[PDB]
């Protein structure tokens, strides 16, 4: 957890409990593949854009826009 | 001959990136931004303007809870005014209207509508006016992680409009026509904080589907 440390510090990020905590840390690793796997995808001309890993690496896209 | 391209932010028309934070403010600095850019073009000044101001004051608008442009650009007419950022400055948080008249540091005499899905309209808006309010989807995964490139994703619904953003210009890249988007999700989003949409791509993510700029 030694990235997942730094991404929390960084970002002051907080939890209410392992269980949510957790629960977020599940949704930033899928994000990070989700990222890993577009980025693949943009270098063999399937994307005109890149992606990268944010402040909102522990959220849905949905949550972003719908509070 | 040179291409036919506007950034506004070469101008001196645009202020820094801000972060809304927690608070369903996008409305807030989506107005203040186009506001931002009459102020610029009227007076010589580039001034922040108070996202707080409207937030707080704005009561056809839902502050943290979200909003239109159109009552933010109504709201500083009827009021004869808006505060600058450092007269009213942002909380992040829905508080009483606290509006001071000695702090007003721009005005606005109505708004105008975009035709609906009209990108070739937005074009001419964005080349003659200035700066415009834009409503898209950015609900996608893609949009959320958006770090550098022209955005084009076919999954993005023109019918869904979910964020409130600010058409700063428009040009090309890699063969790619685009809008120059600024966010107000911090400089750590997109490419210091702004996003190149696509442009001509049948109206990708609604971008001319709600369109309004305050006149001044
Ligand atoms: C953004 N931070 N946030 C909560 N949003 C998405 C809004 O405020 C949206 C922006 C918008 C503008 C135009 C078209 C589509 C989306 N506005 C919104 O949710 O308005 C809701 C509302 C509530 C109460 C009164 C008026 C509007
Ligand atoms: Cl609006
Ligand atoms: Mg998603």
């Known amino acids: 957890d030694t990235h997942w440390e730094l991404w929390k510090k960084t970002h002051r990020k907080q939890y209410n409990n392992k269980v949510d905590e957790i629960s977020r840390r599940l949704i930033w690793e899928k994000n990070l593949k989700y990222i890993s796997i577009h980025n693949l995808e943009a270098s063999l001309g399937v994307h005109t854009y890149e992606l990268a890993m944010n402040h909102l690496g522990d959220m849905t896209s949905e949550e972003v826009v719908q509070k | 001959r040179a291409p036919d391209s506007v950034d506004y932010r070469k101008k001196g028309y645009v202020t820094p990136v801000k972060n809304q934070g927690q608070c369903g403010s996008c409305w807030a600095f989506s107005s203040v931004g186009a506001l931002e850019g009459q102020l610029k073009k009227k007076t010589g000044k580039l001034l922040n303007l108070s996202p707080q101001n409207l937030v707080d004051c704005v009561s056809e608008n839902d502050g943290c809870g979200g909003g239109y442009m159109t009552n933010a650009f109504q709201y500083v007419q009827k009021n004869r005014g808006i505060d600058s950022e450092d007269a009213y400055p942002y909380v992040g948080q829905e508080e009483s209207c606290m509006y001071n008249p000695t702090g007003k540091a721009a005005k606005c005499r109505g708004y105008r509508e975009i035709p609906e899905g009209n990108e070739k309209a937005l074009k001419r808006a964005v080349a003659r006016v200035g700066p415009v309010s834009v409503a ?43 809008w120059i988007i600024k966010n107000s999700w911090g400089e750590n989003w997109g490419n210091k904080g702004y996003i190149l949409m696509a442009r001509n791509k049948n109206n990708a993510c609604g971008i001319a589907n709600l369109a309004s700029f305050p006149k001044m």
Not at chain 2, 141 to 156: A, H, I, L, N, R
Not at chain 2, 161 to 168: D, F, G, I, K
């Open chain 2, 136 to 178: 898209i989807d950015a609900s996608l995964t893609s949009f959320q992680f958006y770090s550098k490139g022209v955005y084009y994703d076919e999954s993005c619904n023109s019918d869904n409009l979910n964020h409130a953003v600010l058409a700063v210009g428009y040009g090309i890249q890699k063969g790619n026509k685009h």
